[PDB]
Structure formats: C-alpha cells, structure tokens
C-alpha cells in the first residue's frame, strides 16, 4: 500500500494503542490475520498458490 504508512506501522508508536497491525507484504491496514501477519487478499493469493505451507482448501 502506501509505503510511508507501511514504514510507520513498522516503527514504534508513542504507545501500542497508537499502532495498528498491517499486512507487511502489501500494507493493507485491515482484514489482518495474526496467525499469518497479512491481509485476506494476500493470504488468499499465496495460500492458493501453495506458498503458505500447511494451508490447503477446506471442504468444511
């Protein structure tokens, strides 16, 4: 996303309540996932390609 926003998310805020998680691959501010530290779209693309080990399609 906005590279400056990515860098500010990476940096240390004045306190943690000032900082929000971002997909550091694409910097999307939201749709985040803690287990993978990236957004829903990046997660879907790369898991679909199989670049995320252990993550396959779910039949339920």
């Amino acid at each position: 996303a906005k590279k400056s926003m990515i860098i500010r998310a990476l940096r240390k805020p004045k306190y943690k309540t000032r900082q929000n998680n971002r997909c550091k691959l694409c910097g999307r501010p939201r749709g985040y996932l803690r287990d993978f530290c990236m957004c829903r779209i990046c997660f879907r693309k790369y898991a679909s390609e199989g670049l995320i080990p252990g993550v396959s399609k779910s039949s339920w």
């Binding site: 749709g31 996932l33 287990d35 829903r40 779209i41 997660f43 879907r44 898991a47 080990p53 252990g54 993550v55 396959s56 399609k57 779910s58 039949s59 339920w60």
Partner: protein, 102 residues
C-alpha cells in the same frame, strides 16, 4: 509406575513423513535395546480460516482453508544418558519436528 520417562512429541503438517520419522525413532531406540511404550496418536489440530473471495463488495461468496497439524507421542522407559544423547543426535527430514521432555 516408572523411575522416569522420556516424553517425545512429534509434530508435523504431513502424515507420511511424520509416520516415517516415527518408525525411524522406534527402530533407533530398539537398536539401543530399551523397552518402549507404543507410538500413541494425539488428536489432529485443525484451524479453519474463512476469507472473502472478491477484493470488493461481494460478501455472500467466500473460501475456506485449513491448517492441519498431526501429532504423535512416544514414551521411553528407564532413561539412559546414551539413549538421550542418541535421540538428540538423530538427524531428521524437514517437515517433521520433535519436542523432548525428560
């Protein structure tokens, strides 16, 4: 009960190589001549994720994935220093991981 036991938990994503490592370890310890308690299968841990499909409004349509973790357990009776040293020395294919408690 027992003087002490070595509790070793095998964690993997892949059943095949997890199993392979399991028999590798059981053969490696029976080579050292120690009594063994059976490789005992722990429940598989399934983490399901549901994500949107379209990069925009379409909400009724989604897609589901899992992460599956498969776990086995080995118990070793009458711990031996050489036995523990050999267990730590064993090399191991990637994708199957080991946790050891004395």
């Amino acid at each position: 009960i027992a003087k002490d036991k070595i509790r070793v938990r095998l964690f993997s994503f892949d059943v095949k190589i997890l199993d392979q490592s399991a028999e590798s370890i059981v053969k490696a310890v029976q080579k050292a001549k120690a009594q063994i308690k059976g490789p005992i299968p722990l429940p598989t841990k399934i983490k399901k994720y549901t994500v949107l499909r379209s990069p925009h409004v379409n909400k009724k349509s989604r897609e589901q994935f899992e992460m599956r973790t498969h776990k086995r357990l080995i118990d070793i009776l009458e711990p031996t220093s050489a036995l523990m040293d050999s267990l730590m020395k064993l090399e191991l294919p990637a994708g199957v991981e080991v946790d050891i408690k004395q």
